[PDB]
Amino acid sequence: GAMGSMERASLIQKAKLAEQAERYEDMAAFMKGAVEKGEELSCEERNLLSVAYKNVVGGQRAAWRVLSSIEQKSNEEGSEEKGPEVREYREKVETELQGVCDTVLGLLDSHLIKEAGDAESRVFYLKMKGDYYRYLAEVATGDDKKRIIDSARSAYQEAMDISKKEMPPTNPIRLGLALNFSVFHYEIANSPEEAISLAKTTFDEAMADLHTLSEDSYKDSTLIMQLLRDNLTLWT
């Protein structure tokens, strides 16, 4: 651990500075260092961890898609053979992406999930586990693709089961989990009807619970509800 000599509090402070400077690779390294101190994370710290790696892997995914599109075109009929370079560079980006996903999954497995006993923390980490297996599934083409997909499904499902038992239907973690599991169904599991059913049921159950909320909680919940509606509009 290159962060092993830095104070936990200093790592958290620098992660926040890195976020302000849009230095997300640095942000992720600082938060990895903080996790490796071994203490459980607060809600704010969990958010810093997730924001950091979301931005890093999000950029990798965008680049992988650009390169995969070029590679696909290169293998159409009538395309000029241009050598191994497009595949090689897509593979380079892919391997870096897989490395980031493995790093995040490693932090969750050693030992964030097993020490997370409150519903809000456990669901949050299990959602992340589903998310990073989902990103691995996006680039998987070989013997383990089915097992990677099932690993995503299993983590999301455990998170869903806890969230339905322990959190209200407007809870933003519960909503965000459902949003992403619905995308998993649509884009990864080839299950668009399940994706639509999940998004619609989540939206309607949340609508019926908004009356219990403060103005600030209402703002949080309806923002994610609009994302559910946005996806439903895309899919129907």
Binding site: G176, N180, L227
Partner: peptide
């Protein structure tokens, strides 16, 4: 590409 958080 659909929305995720």
């Amino acid at each position: 590409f659909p929305a995720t958080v």
